[PDB]
């Protein structure tokens, strides 16, 4: 589950929701499962998620879990 995801799982998760384009950068920033729920709009910008739609997809996917 989320809290137990390593940076690679988060990467796999991004692919599963069609945002694999963002996995390398997330990985370089050492983003792990436990970090996801706390990422702000600014963290996402810094992580390369500059398209509101994609940030919304990430956010929506987090609520599903
Ligand atoms: Cl984007
Ligand atoms: Zn994107």
From Swiss-Prot:
Widely expressed in brain (at protein level). It comes from the Eukaryota. It is found in: Cytoplasm; Postsynaptic density; Cell projection, Dendritic spine. Residues 5-65 form the SAM domain. Major scaffold postsynaptic density protein which interacts with multiple proteins and complexes to orchestrate the dendritic spine and synapse formation, maturation and maintenance. Interconnects receptors of the postsynaptic membrane including NMDA-type and metabotropic glutamate receptors via complexes with GKAP/PSD-95 and HOMER, respectively, and the actin-based cytoskeleton. Plays a role in the structural and functional organization of the dendritic spine and synaptic junction through the interaction with Arp2/3 and WAVE1 complex as well as the promotion of the F-actin clusters. May homomultimerize via its SAM domain. Interacts with BAIAP2, DBNL and SLC17A7/VGLUT1. Interacts with DLGAP1/GKAP, GRM1/MGLUR1, GRM5/MGLUR5 and LZTS3 C-termini via its PDZ domain. Interacts with ABI1, HOMER1, HOMER2, HOMER3 and CTTN/cortactin SH3 domain. Is part of a complex with DLG4/PSD-95 and DLGAP1/GKAP. Interacts (via PDZ domain) with the GRIA1 subunit of the AMPA receptor (via PDZ-binding motif). Interacts with WASF1 and CYFIP2; the interactions mediate the association of SHANK3 with the WAVE1 complex. In isoform 1, the N-terminal region preceding the ANK repeats interacts with the 6 ANK repeats in an intramolecular manner, thereby restricting access to ligands, such as SHARPIN and SPTAN1. Belongs to the SHANK family. This is SH3 and multiple ankyrin repeat domains protein 3. It comes from Rattus norvegicus. The gene is Shank3.
């Amino acid at each position: 589950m989320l809290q137990l995801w390593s940076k690679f799982d988060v990467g796999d998760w991004l692919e599963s929701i069609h945002l694999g384009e963002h996995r390398d950068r997330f990985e370089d920033h050492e983003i792990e499962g436990a970090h996801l729920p706390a990422l702000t709009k600014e963290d996402f910008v810094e992580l390369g998620v500059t398209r509101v739609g994609h940030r919304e997809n990430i956010e929506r996917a987090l609520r599903q879990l």
